[PDB]
Design a protein around this ligand. Sequence first.
Ligand SMILES: O=C(CCCC[C@@H]1SC[C@@H]2NC(=O)N[C@@H]21)Nc1ccc([N+](=O)[O-])cc1
Ligand SMILES: O=C(CCCC[C@@H]1SC[C@@H]2NC(=O)N[C@@H]21)Nc1ccc([N+](=O)[O-])cc1
Ligand SMILES: O=C(CCCC[C@@H]1SC[C@@H]2NC(=O)N[C@@H]21)Nc1ccc([N+](=O)[O-])cc1
Ligand SMILES: O=C(CCCC[C@@H]1SC[C@@H]2NC(=O)N[C@@H]21)Nc1ccc([N+](=O)[O-])cc1
Lengths: 118, 121, 118, 121
Amino acid sequence: AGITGTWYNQLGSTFIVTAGADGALTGTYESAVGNAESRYVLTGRYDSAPATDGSGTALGWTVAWKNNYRNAHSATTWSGQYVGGAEARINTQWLLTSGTTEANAWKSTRVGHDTFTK
Amino acid sequence: AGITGTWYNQLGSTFIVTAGADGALTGTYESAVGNAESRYVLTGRYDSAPATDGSGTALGWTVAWKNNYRNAHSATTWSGQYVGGAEARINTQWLLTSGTTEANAWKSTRVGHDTFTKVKP
Amino acid sequence: AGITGTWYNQLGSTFIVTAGADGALTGTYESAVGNAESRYVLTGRYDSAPATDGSGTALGWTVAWKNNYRNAHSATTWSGQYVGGAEARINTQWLLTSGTTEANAWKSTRVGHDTFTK
Amino acid sequence: AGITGTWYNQLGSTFIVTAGADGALTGTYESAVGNAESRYVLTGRYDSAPATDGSGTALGWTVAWKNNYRNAHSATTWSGQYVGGAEARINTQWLLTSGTTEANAWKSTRVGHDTFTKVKP
Ligand SMILES: O=C(CCCC[C@@H]1SC[C@@H]2NC(=O)N[C@@H]21)Nc1ccc([N+](=O)[O-])cc1
Ligand SMILES: O=C(CCCC[C@@H]1SC[C@@H]2NC(=O)N[C@@H]21)Nc1ccc([N+](=O)[O-])cc1
Ligand SMILES: O=C(CCCC[C@@H]1SC[C@@H]2NC(=O)N[C@@H]21)Nc1ccc([N+](=O)[O-])cc1
Ligand SMILES: O=C(CCCC[C@@H]1SC[C@@H]2NC(=O)N[C@@H]21)Nc1ccc([N+](=O)[O-])cc1
């Protein structure tokens, strides 16, 4: 409900997900940069019973960059927390791993942080 | 994509996957360290159509540290590549984020790296 | 000159550094959160001859959390780029490693991203 | 703190340090991979007064990928702990950031992990 919705990060990406009962996140992702074309499938997990304190709700999803238009041969996992409020945000960090040959395995991962607004 | 199987990272945590022909991962995860105990559910995505050159297959998945045995208010995202051959290893980096308050948001994410293989206790 | 100065991140930390001729960064750091008390020494490296394009200047320093008031037994390395301008910023990401016993080695590192303003 | 020595990560890059009694590291770094060639300078900080329990000594250092041989417009920060014993290993994670334009800022940082030891070619 708080999490279930449609979001947007600073890069302009579109994040449409449904916060499951089981603690499942399901939806689609449309990236605004990189070799992304249109929506991609997306799946993750969230804390069904977050702290009662003020803590945010932890979560994280995974976009495998393959659909009918492009296959960038690589997945991104966003790990972060949701914070409800007057400024409902979803703050995260993410990991861009690329299939590569062991000789490039070292420069295989790209790292960063996306902040979503609703 | 020998991906569907039972793997083991160096912490000896068990990871059990099944890769659908669509690009989805499902299954469980049982850590050997941390506020964990028993199986936690896992949901992921992976490249159903990987490059045919040498390139390894890419993948990712999440485990919300909550189940019937415990709730650690946190989640981990594994991101890396499945690399096949004689010994099959799936190489990843990970982000473990615990839910927190403003004052702590800053130190909410821990970062690490896990290597998984088909055998070892 | 562009880099040499005194900065501030979103957490309120104070970053005072001098951009060396050699490509050396030197100065002090005063953190606003964690177990930091007062200034700590700091040392790093920067790109002496950055791209002529529009690219930012890459850099990165290291604060070892020990001074006369506290020793949090841990170092932080910030890796990022400087971007001059009307909104001169220094965007980075950092790694908080803690001395620990191999049994906690796994949860040894803490990750994040600081954005500095001048 | 056997820290001052000659180490080697699994990529077989050479790292040469000297730890001052103040908490500073100095020396060079010679990668075996990437837009690197020859020695690049390195500046770091480390715990001069480490915990006496078991805890490993923490450390960090930076290498701006520029010298007389090449300029890759990027820098790497290694962060981790020196862990002594029979075989001495210094365990780190790293952030390699290349300078870029707005449109690319988003993919400027690569992340990885390196393990260093006193011997191996
Ligand atoms: O494989 C990629 C696919 C597209 C990347 C989307 C990323 S997910 C993190 C960030 N947040 C967003 O909303 N969008 C970006 N593209 C790609 C891969 C490699 C290179 N490269 O230069 O190596 C360039 C683009
Ligand atoms: O309760 C959690 C979950 C347990 C973490 C297991 C980690 S997942 C990365 C690595 N790979 C594995 O197979 N096992 C380990 N962790 C947690 C929660 C809060 C805090 N905290 O500091 O507040 C620290 C850790
Ligand atoms: O060892 C630490 C020392 C202080 C941390 C300063 C960090 S550097 C990244 C970030 N940017 C800032 O400007 N300040 C913070 N503190 C510490 C260590 C462990 C825990 N812990 O709960 O485990 C709490 C505080
Ligand atoms: O030119 C650079 C520097 C070479 C990187 C060596 C890395 S440091 C982490 C690891 N540990 C080592 O000992 N060696 C490797 N890299 C660079 C610059 C630009 C891009 N780019 O994609 O634009 C990629 C890599």
